[PDB]
Structure 1
């Protein structure tokens, strides 16, 4: 499949202008291109978690900002998620496993990747632990 130019524009605006806090990508009904499905400027991580579908897959980009120790400000890292819940259809899980690289090879500046199979692998403390260390 191909990456819709709009998906690349939405990424450049998050990356270079912090225009969005997170973006959700998915396949078009035709299942031929990867488009944006939802964008948001909500800083609450909970708000992002609430949009993750329990029975379907998606891809997402999150602008993860965390406190950098030493009485120094913050750091921000772009995290790429593959949301693929055990409760999702096998054909969906697979088509999304397939199309992942199309969208992933195209994004430049992603610091860390997360493969969410459930809400524990995508929890705040869990993302923060991966992002903090040698990511």
Structure 2
């Protein structure tokens, strides 16, 4: 069996995600794992997705995270893991990605991990 499993999304994640989707009071949310729970790290107003990831790149408090970004036509969801992140941290974020995806609906799930702002130049 795996060392880490059964990590859970707290209700507040779904609450704020729905605030974003329905009430449009923010344009992005960053989720992290703390105390074996997925919680909200921060949220804010959408400029561009590139600008969001640039901010994340410069914020060393964030090693890995799940991110949603309201691009209006779609809400993108992705895992972020900076190149310098620890492989074992990446493994637990990877395995817990399914947990947050079960709790939030209506997102476009990106097919690649985002490591830096270069990766979102699509």
TM-score range, shorter chain: 0.7 to 0.9
The correspondence for 2:117, drawn from 107, 119, 123, is: 119
Q: How many residues align?
A: 112
Q: What CA deviation, in whole Å up to 9, does each residue of 1:44-91 have, x standing for no partner?
A: 4454123324771111000013xxxxxxxxxx2100011022221112
Which structure shows the higher strand fraction?
1
1:82 aligned onto 2:83: no
1:25 aligned onto 2:31: yes
Question: TM-score of the superposition, structure 1-length normalised?
Answer: 0.74
Q: Which residue in 2 is equivalent to 1:103?
A: 100
What is the aligned-residue RMSD (CA, Å)? 1.8
Q: Of the two, which has the highest radius of gyration?
A: 1
* Structure 2 gap ranges (5+): 1-6
CA distance in 2, matches of 1:77, 1:119: 19
Q: Which residue in 1 is equivalent to 2:21?
A: 15
* Structure 1 gap ranges (5+): 66-75, 127-135
Of structures 1 and 2, the one with the larger relative CO (CA 8 A, separation 6+) is 2
Q: What CA deviation, in whole Å up to 9, does each residue of 1:22-58 have, x standing for no partner?
A: 0000001x2x110001110142445412332477111
Contact (CA 8 Å) 2:8, 2:99: kept in 1 or not?
A: yes
CA distance in 2, matches of 1:110, 1:42: 16
Contact (CA 8 Å) 2:17, 2:104: kept in 1 or not?
A: yes
Task: Write out aligned runs for 1:43-54 (5 A).
Answer: 43-53=47-57
1:95 to partner: Cα distance: 1.0
Q: Which residue in 2 is equivalent to 1:72?
A: none
